[PDB]
Structures are given as C-alpha cells and as structure tokens.
C-alpha cells in the first residue's frame, strides 16, 4: 500500500497526444518532481514537439473514493494523493478550477465521492443539495465581506468561564515579530481594551483599538466586554499562579488570516397496499414466511396490524396479496408510517427483516405505484416488538446483496394529492370548575385522562403551555379531524422555553409543526449552551423522515455562524460515516457544511489525514506487538513516524479535541503506545510559541467505541457548569475525548498525572505522593484540590451510576485533583444500582492524614450533598438529553429503564427533603462500608 | 379456573437448576449470534469497499478508452503528413506506443476481473452469514422467554434475590 511502503511504483501516463509511457517513480515523490521526470522522458517518446511546456497541465488521477480529481496542488507526494491505480494524465490547466477543486477535496474528506449522491437519482437528495448548498456558500460569501472583529468572533468565539476578587497578578504581553516583551501590573478585573492600551505605551517610536490580545501558541484571543478574570486562560493562569504570555496583534494581521476566498380529505376509501414479492430472503427451507406490516405515527398505531399467508420459505417468495387496513386514506396524518416486518414461521417466531415507509413524500405527495424497499436485518432485543415503527425511514445502501420487499400503493385518483397546505388545515380548525381541578390534577403530576385533557385542549393552551407534549401525545392522529384541531393551536401556541423544547424533538413527536415549534424555542440558544447540547441534537436527525428538515437548517445555521460548532458538527457527523443507516443524510449536511467553510475544510483535510498515518501507524504496533518485545516495537514505531510523509502529516495541526490548541512537533522519543487490549497511541506535541506547560499530547485509540466515554465527559462537564454556575467550583477534569471514526478516536492526555495504582503500588502514600508534588505550604492547596474533586467525582459517579471503579482507572493530578477515567459502564451496567462510594484511603487525604478530623470531613459532606442538590434541581435536562441519546443506539442506553436509572439516582419523584434525608442514609452507609472493605 | 404451563420441573431447587441451565445456554447463543454480527457488518463494509473499487476500475478504463479515442484522431494527421516524406519511423514509434498502451487496458481489465469474482464470492459469504443468523434467531429468543417464565416462577414462589443471581451467574 501507499501509506507504508518506501519504495518505487510503476506509474503510467497519459499523455494529451495519445502518447503513452511507463517508468517507475517514488512513492514519497511528490507531483512536481514527477513531471519533470516526465518531460525528461517523454522527450525520446514521439510527438514531443506538440506538447507545450510542463506549467501547462495538470496532473488527473482516478482517487480512492472512484472519482477524476485534477491534483492542482503539486506540492503533495504521490503516496498522499493514493491514486486507485498508479495512473496520470495530463490535461488542461484552464477550466473552473474552483468548483471542481472542493468538489474533489468534499469527497475525500467526508469519506464518501460525491457520484454517489448522483448515482442514487434520488429528486430528494437533489433537491437537498441544490438548496443547502446555495444557503451555504451564500453564508460565507456575506461572511466574508464583514469586518475583522465580527470575522475573530466566528474563526475565534470567546472561551469563557460560567461566572469573583478584584485581587491583582501581573502579567507578560509582547508583539508579533519581536524577540522582546513588557511584563507588567494587571487587577483581575480589567477589560481587555484597558490592557492593550497599556502595552501599547512601548517607550512611552512615539492606537489600542486597531488590536486583540492573542494566548501565544494557541488560536485563543482574549476581546470584548468582558474582565479578565472571566476568560479561560486567565482564570486557569491565576488558579495555578502561572503569568499569563500574551501577544499583541493587528487588525491588519487578522483580515491576513481571513482573506482566503471561497382535496385529499374526499378520498373516504379505506387505505390498502399491494404485496407481491420478497427477493434475496436468506432463511431455513423447512419454515415458512409471513409478511406482518402496520402503520404508525410516531411510537402508537394508527389502527390493527395486518398480516399475510404463509408462503413457503426461498429466496424468491410471491404473494400478490391486497392488505386492507382499518383506516381511510383521509384519515391518515402527514407523517403516516408504514412499517412491515418479514417474519419465519411454523406452518400449523423468527423475525428475518424490516423495512419503513413514509405514504406522503418530501413534497406532500401521497406516493402511489411500484416500490422496491430493500430492508434491515432485524435484531433480537428484550422488548421483542412484533414491527420496527422507531427504525429508519431510509433504504438499506447494500442494494446489490439485501434482501427487499416489492409492493405497490394503488392509484387513488386521476389528479395526485397532496397533503393539504397550512391555510386549509387552519381553516377546518378554528371550530373554579370541576373540570379545571381534574385538569390542573392531571397536569401538576391514561385513558379516562386522555379525553379529559383533549376537550380542555384550549384551557392547557392559556393556563398549562409547558404540559403541550402531553396535549399532543393524547390526540387521536389516526382522525384528521383531530389532527387539524391540535396544528389549529399549535401554530398559535405561546414560546416554551429550551428545556421543554428539548423534549418536543424526541421520536414521539414526529409531526413537522411541532419539530419547527421545538427548533423555534432554541433560537434563543447561546453558543456555549447550544454546544453543551450538540451532541444530542446530531443524534435527533437519526429519527428524522425527509432529508431537508428544520433541525438540519438550524445546525447548519449555527456551525456557519460559529466555527467551533462547525468543528464539533463535522466530526459528530463524520465519525458516523461508516453506519448505513444515517451514511447518505449525514454525508450530504457534511457536503453542505464544507460548501459554506472552504477555509475549516483546509484544517480538517490536515486533521483526516493525520488521523490517517495514526490508523496505519497503529496497525504496525498491533502486529508487532504480537510479533516482537515492547522496547523493539517502541523502536520501530518510531522509525515509521521518521518517514517525511508521517512526520509532516502528523505534524502542525490544529486538534481535533480542540481546535483552537495546536499540535505544532511532535515529540517521537516522547511517543509511545500504552498496554492495552487495543494498544492505544501515546502521541506527544511541543510548540515553540507556547509557555510554560505548552507540551499537549493525544492518544489515539483504534478498536474500541469512545462515544460512552464522551457522553460521560459531556455530562461531567455539564455537571461541572451547573456547579460553577452556583458558585461551586470542584476542580473536574472533563478531558477531550472525541469519536473520529469507525471505532476510532482520540482522547486528551492529562498530563503531570499518575493512576491510584502506580502511586500506592510505587516507593500512607497517596498523602506522601502530594507531599512530594506539593511541598511545605502548597500542601494545602492539593488536599482541598483532593477534596472538592473528591466530592464530585463522587456523586457525578453516583448520578451516572458508573460502576468498575478502582485503582488504575482513578487518576491523580500533581494540583491534587482527583479523575476518573475510561467511562466504558454505566447506569448500573457492567443492571443494578451502584451504591455511593465513599473510599478510605480518600477520606485519608480529606482528613489531613488524621484519624478524626470532623471540621473537614463536614465540609466534603457539605460539598457532596450541595452538588447532589443542584444536579436534582436541573433533573429534567438530564433526563430530556438522555431521552435523545436514546437514538445513538449505544447498548447500555437504549430504553426506558436506562432513564429510570437517573430518575432514581436524583430522587426526582420523591421532594427535596426527602432525596436529602435519603442522600445522607446513602453517604452515611457508604462510610461505614468504607472501613470493612479495606481490611 | 385458569391454566398456563411453560415450566417443566417442579420444585424449587429442580426449576432453579433448570433457570441456570437455560440462562447458560441462553448467553452462549447471545455469543455466537454476537460473533456473527461482527462478520455481517465486517462483511457489507468490505463489500461496499470492493464494489466503489469496481466504480474505480470502471473510471480508471474510462480514462484509457479516451486515451485510444485521442490517440486515433489525433495521430491520423502526422502518420499520413509524414508518409510523403518517409518518416516511416514515426509510424512505427506510434502505432507501437499505441499497441504499448492497448496491452496496458488489457491488464486493467483482467485486476477488475478479478476483483468481480472476489465480490460474487463474498455476496455469498454475505448471504449464508445472513442465513446462519436467521436460524439462530429462533433458538435465541425461545431461550430468552424461557430463561424469563423460569425466573417469574421462581420469584413468584418468594425465592431469594441471592438464589436467582446464582443461577443466573
Ligand atoms: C485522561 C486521559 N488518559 C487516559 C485514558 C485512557 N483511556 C481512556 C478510555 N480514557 C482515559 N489514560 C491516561 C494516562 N495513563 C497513564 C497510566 C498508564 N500510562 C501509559 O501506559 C503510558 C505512559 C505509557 C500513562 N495518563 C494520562 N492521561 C490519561
């Protein structure tokens, strides 16, 4: 292959006279070296004469993903480029060099070439392009003609803290180019604006405004309205008592960094479909095959589910078979789902396969004649369901080898119908009591309660609008009667906020009214709120119907506008390419993106393809790993970083766990891998513009599924907000850690720390660990840096219900601050519920090494218990953003008992004293348990 | 006046011996449907990746087809312009790069061969890797409502938590 190998290749070319040569090059060759080696041969080859010179064409090649793209950049090495078959040709350099360029780059950085979007015929996937892409580019052609300070608010938005003394630290700031800088005096709370004013004064040769300070080495920028004490860096700086580097830039400079261009409620005939053939069907000859099918709006039926003869069991299975359903074609609402499931059965239960269908298509049309649904193979679960209403939407991809399911919906008139429009559906729709206590009863906690609240619908409308998703849930869907008359008071139902918003974009409220009424109440969303939900709201377009979509608008909205959300969406949809079920619609939102973001798409092709070498890189030490000692692999790893085509790859990138931190060279004696079942990558960064503690590493993990470990830190680090939001700040260590790519990811290196183990294991020791890390005075900082932490690792532990805790997945940081790490259980699983865990050796620490040491051992009490209080207040965002995550399809969060962990763990049924009286019982149990275990 | 009999054995300890039996066997077939699963997404992964291959060859032929397209209008000027003038070199330097790059298609075309017989063999993996799992199905889910009626039973009759996590371990 092109990734490893050193050597020579054998490459053809094709030359614009017909002419045609083949001599060997190599493989680190890069294309401009190439074509000089050409034209030196083709020299002795006929009609030399004709060509013209070299800087008139262009190399094209057939790339990985099966398309022409035109190798423009001739800068990069033959084995970057991996052509499918070492093959160039040489055409004109003229054309639109443009639109074909990002074309090509689109398709090998989303993993999937652009022709098969084409390929499909597909109008809904055409017409998703043509109107996303236009909103995209339009989007950054207004972007770019705006000015510098709203440009570093969209390439640099301000990472601050939730949110404080007006105490006073100095600090270092310099200019760009100059070996020389001016330390000086700074309180917390002054305004970045005063700051550069003040550096601005050099000598006295001899204006601040022209300026932005920059956190050297880092694409971080410290601007605005805002003190100094509110920004990460400085915050972090002050907690730790480094000085703070920064590095005056002008607004020249940024516009350098940012000039790169680029009717149908007549039809009363009941609704019926046409069954005819199944092809492909792999089952036992003996059985024989039965057709299930029903249709859905949401998770309830719209009426009983049919079913078909037992036709015995091939390959090739007929039935021609009509299936009435009880229901009229009026009566269906705009989200009708039908849904079959192809069963095995004993003559006189085997689930073989399913497959969805939505009746109306993206343009309103109620679908009529042939369709051919090649379906997915179904899988046992607990809850064993007879159909699969809460399954995809979209075609199985492998259409060659699937099995499918050919039907046909009759012709229900001679003109086709639509679902009505707004206006229609508005027009049929207009049309201290015993009943308000019932109401009020209902609401501040069936089937008596579901007609109650529906003939009260309009008292709910002005009296209970955040008990809307229970007003939808009991109207009758199967009646459009009904259907109008809800959609009546929804388009004039007042604003809720986003915690109740984020409820309405779950699978049970398919509609697209009330998915438009959700993504409407969270506009209101702020950058820094809106990525504490990012990962969620991705995994909602998993139970979306039809391509285009508000929520697929909204996302691309906010990742123009932002470009860390832009970071973070790309590599959610990205490293998800690989599943079939969401492969074309997440493809086509990354195609969208990249459109509206040619200058991020230039730092994510360097990220692909330092991710890349890492995979192959990995692969080496997995099999040498088998082959060879650790010393010699170690060895050998490193040779293979050496090669110019690795190291520059991996070398001078922004990260993927956090764009605005570079990784500018890497350390390779530094680099190691660690032992593990997978053999993780131990990858070290160093940067010369940096300061103190500039040297970041990675580990990139190849095998395993990270997505359990992110969800976990995003919960950790939203814990940790909710905290510093009511001015509890427990030191966490809500560390990077992103999905990349099938069964890849990296995670974020915490350094100076050390695991439990290694610490006791190594030469009562854990107190002497600190002692050595933090001598004499700085003692105390470590233990109340132990305690706070300690505290909430405890009950965010407890919370998420995270068992498998010990010593070598603890970690300690040299701060003092106490971690967990590798997050691959929890809500029980390994279930059961986890008890709160209260260790000896940590109760140790907390107490100063005493045996009693109560005034400090009632403070981590405290910080326990008011933690666990203000995670309950804040309960219902915990359970609405697991509720979504439902769709992820991770194994140990996939129903309602998983949320039910939660529900119990906060207490949220039982009130506030209560859950504290419990929580106590729970911490009080969990000391006395702390004793009898260590012995 | 009401009946339903799915347990075979009869007391406590005979059922619970036969809870532990069905939940073994139970999770050995979750395994090897399990281990199956891998191979089927291994394999449609694979296969996707063989048939974009295909498309590639296709393309990568494509390109070839165009080169002989262009190498036969554009040479039919220079072959007849330099036979009146007895350049009968040029002619034999042509036509002999053009027969080098005919020759060159011809290995192309067999490597794209080759790579159709790898795709039709394992669609057949595929399809049988299907099959296997299709005929475990059944065995898998009766022992899960077994393992289930088992389990009820024994927790109707008022047996211990620590009883049945036993069995079940
Ligand atoms: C917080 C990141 N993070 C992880 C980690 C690994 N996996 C998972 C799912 N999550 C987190 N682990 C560490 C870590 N480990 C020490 C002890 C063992 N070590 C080695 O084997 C290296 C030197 C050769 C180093 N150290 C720092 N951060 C870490």
Redo the contacts with the bound molecule.
Sequence with gaps: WTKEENQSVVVDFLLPTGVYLNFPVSRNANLSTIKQLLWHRAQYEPLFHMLSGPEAYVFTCINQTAEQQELEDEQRRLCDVQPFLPVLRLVAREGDRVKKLINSQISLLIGKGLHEFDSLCDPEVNDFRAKMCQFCEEAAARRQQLGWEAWLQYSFPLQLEPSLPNRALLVNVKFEGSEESFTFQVSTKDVPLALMACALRKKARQQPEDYTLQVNGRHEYLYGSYPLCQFQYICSCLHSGLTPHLTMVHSSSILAMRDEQSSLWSLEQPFRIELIQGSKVNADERMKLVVQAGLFHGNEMLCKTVSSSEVSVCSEPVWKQRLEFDINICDLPRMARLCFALYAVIEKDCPIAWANLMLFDYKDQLKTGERCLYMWPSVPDEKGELLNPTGTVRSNPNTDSAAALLICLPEVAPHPVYYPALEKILELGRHTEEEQLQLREILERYEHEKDLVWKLRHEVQEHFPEALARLLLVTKWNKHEDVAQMLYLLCSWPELPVLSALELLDFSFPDCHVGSFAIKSLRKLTDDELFQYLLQLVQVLKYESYLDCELTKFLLDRALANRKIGHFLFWHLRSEMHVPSVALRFGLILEAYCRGSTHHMKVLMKQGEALSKLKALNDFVKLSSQKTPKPQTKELMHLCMRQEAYLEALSHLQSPLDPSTLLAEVCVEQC?????KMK?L?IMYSNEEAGSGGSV?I?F?NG?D?RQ?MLTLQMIQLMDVLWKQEGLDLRM?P?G?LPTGDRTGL?????R???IA?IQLNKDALLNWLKSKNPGEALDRAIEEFTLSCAGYCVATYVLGIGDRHSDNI?IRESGQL?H????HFLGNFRERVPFILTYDFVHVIQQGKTNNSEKFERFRGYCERAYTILRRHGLLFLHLFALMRAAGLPELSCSKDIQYLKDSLALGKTEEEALKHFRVKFNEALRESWKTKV | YQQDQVVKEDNIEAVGKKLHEYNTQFQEKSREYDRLYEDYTRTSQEIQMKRTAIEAFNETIKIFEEQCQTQERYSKEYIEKFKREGNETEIQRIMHNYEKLKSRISEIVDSRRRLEEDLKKQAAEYREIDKRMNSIKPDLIQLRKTRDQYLMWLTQKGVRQKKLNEWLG
Excluded: Q, R
Excluded at chain 1, 672 to 676: E, I, L
Excluded at chain 1, 747 to 751: A, S
Excluded at chain 1, 821 to 824: A, C, N, P, R, V
């Design positions: 190691t891998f660690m032992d593990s993780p131990w590493g580990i993990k395993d990270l470990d260590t560390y850690c995670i974020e290196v915490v350094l720390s050390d695991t290694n970690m971690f790490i590798d997050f691959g």
